[PDB]
Amino acid sequence: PKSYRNYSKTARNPKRPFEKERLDQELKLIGEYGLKNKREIWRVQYLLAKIRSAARYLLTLDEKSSKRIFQGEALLRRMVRQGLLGENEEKLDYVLGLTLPKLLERRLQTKVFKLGLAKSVHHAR
Amino acid sequence: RDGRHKLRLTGGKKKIHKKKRKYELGRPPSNTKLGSRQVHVVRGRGRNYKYRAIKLDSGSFSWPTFGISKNTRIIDVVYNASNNELVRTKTLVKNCIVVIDSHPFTTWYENTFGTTIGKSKNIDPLLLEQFKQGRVLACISSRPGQCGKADGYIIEGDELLFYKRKMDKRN
Amino acid sequence: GKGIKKHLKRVNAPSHWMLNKMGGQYAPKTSSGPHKLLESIPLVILLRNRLKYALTFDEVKMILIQKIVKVDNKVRTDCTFPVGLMDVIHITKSNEYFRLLYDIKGRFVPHRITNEESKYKLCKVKKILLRKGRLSIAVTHDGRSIPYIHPDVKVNDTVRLDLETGKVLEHLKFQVGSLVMVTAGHSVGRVGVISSIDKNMGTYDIIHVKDSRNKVFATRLSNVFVIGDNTKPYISLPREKGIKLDIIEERRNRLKA
RNA sequence: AACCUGGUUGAUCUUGCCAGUAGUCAUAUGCUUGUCUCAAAGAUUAAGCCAUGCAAGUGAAAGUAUAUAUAUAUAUAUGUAGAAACUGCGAACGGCUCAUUAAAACAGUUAUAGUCUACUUGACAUUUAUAAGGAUAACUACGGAAAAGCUGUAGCUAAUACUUGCAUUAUCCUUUUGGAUAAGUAUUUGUUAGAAGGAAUUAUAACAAAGAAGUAACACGUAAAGUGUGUAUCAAUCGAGUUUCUGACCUAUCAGCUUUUGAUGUUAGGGUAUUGGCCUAACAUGGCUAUGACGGGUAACGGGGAAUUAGAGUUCGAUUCCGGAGAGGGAGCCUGAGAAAUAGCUACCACAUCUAAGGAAGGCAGCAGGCGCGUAAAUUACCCAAUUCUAAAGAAGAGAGGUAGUGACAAGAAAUAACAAUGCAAGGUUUGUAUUGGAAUGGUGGGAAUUUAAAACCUUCCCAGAGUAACAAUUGGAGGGCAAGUCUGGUGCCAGCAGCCGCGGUAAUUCCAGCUCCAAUAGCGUAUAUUAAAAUUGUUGCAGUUAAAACGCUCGUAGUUGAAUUUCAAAGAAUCAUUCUUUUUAAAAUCCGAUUUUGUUACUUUGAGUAAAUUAGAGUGUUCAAAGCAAACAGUUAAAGCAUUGUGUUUGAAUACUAUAGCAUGGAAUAACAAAAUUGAACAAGCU
RNA sequence: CCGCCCGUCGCUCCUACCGAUUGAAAGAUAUGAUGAAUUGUUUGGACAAGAAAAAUUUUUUCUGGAAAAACCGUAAAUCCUAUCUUUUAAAGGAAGGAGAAGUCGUAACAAGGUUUCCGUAGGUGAACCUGCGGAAGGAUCAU
RNA sequence: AAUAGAUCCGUAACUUCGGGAAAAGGAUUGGCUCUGAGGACAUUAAUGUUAACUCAGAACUGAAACGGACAAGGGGA
RNA sequence: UAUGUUCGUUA
């Protein structure tokens, strides 16, 4: 009867809806990356929370544990593929250090504006 | 007709769902009388046939001390360990005690041993007294309502003495 | 009424069949026959999901109508026919011969084999029983009954049956040097030399098995299929050769390309 | 993200709740709504009631054809088919719903050495024969009834329908070979002998009695003998029924229940497919219970799972899968391998249809659809193309199922512009900023490719098609909590707002409006429920002098808890300065200076066996994402690999989890229990 | 302290309670009575086919057998009785709460003008008063 | 007038806990043929002789009737 | 150590 295909939510509402110091930071980010809504930054930080949660779980596992020395390089090679980590970053300790701007710099519109093509991030969008 | 509607182990009453299934079934008893051979056919689960014997008069009966079996006829029903109403109405059941014609056995003894494998069992007096009377006591060993025939074995020795004492410190 | 169920939902189908969730509501319920539904695949998924010859059930039926495919060198035309743990499939039109084996991930794969190879069948005897006249019959994992088996044959042995005649050729025992293939466990598909046979009175007897790389894995005795003696397996094995590699370092061979 | 804030006061610190806050695969509803993907949907209350129509049928070699039609060389032979009907199989699956149900069902874990099992698969059989019998459908003629899936009489005819019924093998011996001997499959009874299982009254074998059912009086044709159908038994398989251990919410203003009426057990039997008080007869007085029996409640089908989770938890699970139960309520029964079946039958109860009034026929909690109910839920659509099932099995069916329709239930992506020049502002000729004025692009319409069972959508291509881009974004707020006005009017303790604190009597930052601003945004409010917040249910982890709260006091059973004590170190190789690995050192039974077992459990470690969906998680650019389980690789037109002239090749669909209970397993610590003296051992010799 | 504040008595509304009425209703169990339908068994016995003779007819017999009946059993359903559960009527009685502003007094908070309070008993329009024994949460940490 | 004996079952409010109570209210009952249970007495673990009517159960039987006449509470609020 | 009551509601 019911369809078997999945569906999930990719964003979480922040709770505490009127933090001035959060609203200002998030508006700074919205404007400077030219994105349409704060739901988008919510998606990005939901993603980042997922990666951070996985990494934080891995750090509790001791080194040379099979689970850690499987999923750690799985996650690490995925991160370097996304480009969030460079050659100068190599361990599980640096995935914890990723931030919203370095996640947003991989969006298509920011990349194209940086590469030229468009003279503004809004023009790129 | 089986399994449910009883009280629990503790004595508590069990709420019932799951109305009666056919595989519980529970067919009515066969009160196998003693008389002319008539049997009926019961179709059990899997189309396996069960022969429900309404009346039998003869049967295969075994002399066990010699390990032989001969076909004789049942004369009367004289005891059963369950309800006495069964013997009073002369019904054949798996452990009923019946009176059996002795002549096929005595004739077989004449023919094989002479005179009135691993032979020469020396017999006993308590059984040949019945033989001289002509009618002998036997215990049914089959289930007439299940197989459709009454078969049994002559009782001798301590079990025979037991049953004779039970039938007849006594009246 | 409550007679036998005749449908199989896709998500209820065995996992090793690999039936996609979104591709229909039902799965092909294998007909009763030589092997259990759980430890066999139907011909529909043998010729539709593995060999990709057919694109649909009707095409599988079209294949089967022409008496082309044979299982144990006899024609089979039932779409839901159990193939089995190990047995030969012959596609005559395309001349090719398969044996159903387990890969180290416990999934039924058709191993390409040669015409000369396709006359030997390894049958794991499961019951030895004597019938009237003291004639001994061996019931095998395949489900065949082989009468007048050699008295030396025991319950957990294996026999090499000749497909065309159904006669035993030689039997193999279950010593601690005999190589075996695992049938249904976590370690389904591995091939190893039997470390030992831990027998416990009244419950499942466990047997420990050494891989080629001296890795020991234990299993229930019922999940074991003697494949050869200590010299070599009596069958060609799939490309993995029945060696299960750790997930951490299978990634290394995947990455190197 | 392991979080708090407003409110008791003149002010303060508490306790403590109220209120705020966020989520909900959680329902309803208000306002609003441009794209595409994706897809829940009459469960809540009424397992209430139903008009209509559909939902299970089936013949491609293989039972039965002078209904009948046709075709080939010459009235013949082969045919090709075939309405109807008999026969066979299926209709016991599927689909729906959740009323019942509280050790019941269900789950994990066993047993069936206590049983049944159609189709399918493998083995394989025993006490007129150049082919046996009647009798029936279809059909023909005559009818009855208002009506019905009603059927009377007479006459024919077959069948794989129904019923009878026609070689032979094995053993003993002189010993390829000759004579002699013997003949029941399951099942039942009696007396015996005895490949395996953990244990046999097992397999099997012998003797003595019975003895089913069968071993083809049947149909069509493949290698340059075959298949179909049917059949005894065994086995396998698809399953089922019982069954072991362990696991469930609230309630003691339910404390004693069960036992004539079977309650607990023994013995005998009946019944069953089998075990069993399942039932009967006799007998005994048992069985459960504060570790909660027996009751009551549940707005309770159980589980896989869902929401919320830092960790513990709390709440939910009618609903994709599994198991159960039901077909208005009960009960009964036929056929059948399988049903206590309900689009099967029989009856009662309640509803309810036709009737000529005599009588007939009914069961949507199947798919649509209607009424009712309610806060609360879609089309009387298209199709068997996929998935799969039934069949006499390619070819027919299937409201199973799929496709579309309705669809702001949820979920994902994502428009409502972007850009250049001058005025103006900031500043050392840099940013913001209304005028212009050209590019870009969808939304829209039309055609096409394509898609599809057909169609639609998606995708792609060609035409027009944006300046107030009128192709015009909303919802809810602006005293505090809590982001945002001491702006302008109106009302004037009214009307009204206000979750809470409060505002409103002429300066209303709070009502009714305008402007502005804030917040989230194709979404935003409201109600109820629930989670966190709540360390305000506290095991982790609360409090009890005075905020609520130590029984008046002591004894005391259950429960919970319980002192210390029984075998301790040294030596070596390896990272950096330490750490890390190996060996022995009592005693009793095995091995001729050396070879090897030494309570029970809890507990802990490893395993085994764990359905998927969901979850975690590996891989993979669905244009991204939700997803899905796929896919990737060279080829303006071929090399390569390999095949002895062609054959694509390389892959994935992993792992983890699956209680606490059960099986196996290493174990030194910590805990119990066992053994241990008003006495109990062992050894040697003699004796039995 | 021109502070705060208690209770009776009056008025209105809301909630719940007791209540004669052998109150009412709807369910659910249990016993009893009656008891449809039906399994099984027995009794039946419309007939439907065989076997004999007479050379169209008849007797007897063997099964198979339909109505119908009986008896055990499975047992719907209705009725009576009892018990329980849920809902609900009611003269009258008697609480509580909520009213912006009632009457009467002054009980408590200051030594609250008789210190307060507890248990218990009696009494009074009301708060309350009195007896006995306690407490300090007292107005005394004290010759 | 209504039963009314006996056996088995069931029995409320209230209560001075003794009662209420035969509460209320159900069922059964003849004859016949049987089955079971209940004692006393003597012999070398064992076998005979003999007695009361009292209960319980079952078949059958009849114009469904059976404390068959006699005898014998009406109950309840 | 004779008696000496009360202060309507809201802000």
Numbering used by the authors:
A (entry chain SE): 2 to 126
B (entry chain SL): 5 to 120, 162 to 213, 216 to 218
C (entry chain SF): 2 to 258
Sentences from the paper on this structure:
Building upon these important proof-of-principle studies in ideal systems, we use in situ cryo-ET to reveal the native translation elongation cycle and its perturbation by a species-specific translation inhibitor in a non-model organism of high medical importance: the malaria-causing parasite Plasmodium falciparum. As such, unlike the model organisms characterized in previous in situ cryo-ET studies, purified Pf80S ribosomes have not been extensively studied in vitro or in vivo and the molecular details of malarial translation remain largely unknown. Our in situ cryo-ET reconstructions reveal an ensemble of translation intermediates sampled by the native Pf80S ribosome, deepening our understanding of translation elongation in eukaryotic pathogens.
As there are only two published cryo-electron microscopy (cryo-EM) structures of the Pf80S in active translation intermediate states, at moderate resolutions of 6.7 and 7.0 Å, we used single-particle cryo-EM to obtain in vitro structures from purified Pf80S ribosomes, yielding five distinct states at substantially higher overall resolutions of 2.4–2.8 Å. Our structures include three active translation intermediate structures, non-rotated Pf80S with P-site and E-site transfer RNAs (tRNAs), non-rotated Pf80S with A-site, P-site and E-site tRNAs, and rotated Pf80S with P-site16 and E-site tRNAs, as well as two off-pathway structures, non-rotated Pf80S with an E-site tRNA and rotated Pf80S with an E-site tRNA. a–c, Single-particle cryo-EM reconstructions, at 2.4–2.8-Å resolution, of the Pf80S ribosome in the POST state with P-site and E-site occupied, with the L1 stalk indicated (a), non-rotated PRE state with P-site, E-site and A-site occupied (b) and rotated PRE state with P-site and E-site occupied (c). Upon proper base pairing, either the E-site tRNA or PfeEF1ɑ dissociates, bringing the ribosome into the decoding-2 state (with tRNAs in the A-site and P-site tRNAs and PfeEF1ɑ still bound) or the non-rotated pre-translocation (non-rotated PRE) state (with tRNAs in the A-site, P-site and E-site and an unoccupied GTPase site), respectively. The presence of the decoding-2, rotated-1 PRE backrolled and non-rotated PRE states together in our parasites suggests that dissociation of the E-site tRNA may occur independently of A-site occupancy, explaining why the E-site is only partially occupied both during and after decoding. Furthermore, the dissociation of the E-site tRNA from the non-rotated PRE state alters the energy landscape of the ribosome such that rotation and possibly back-rolling of the small subunit are favored.
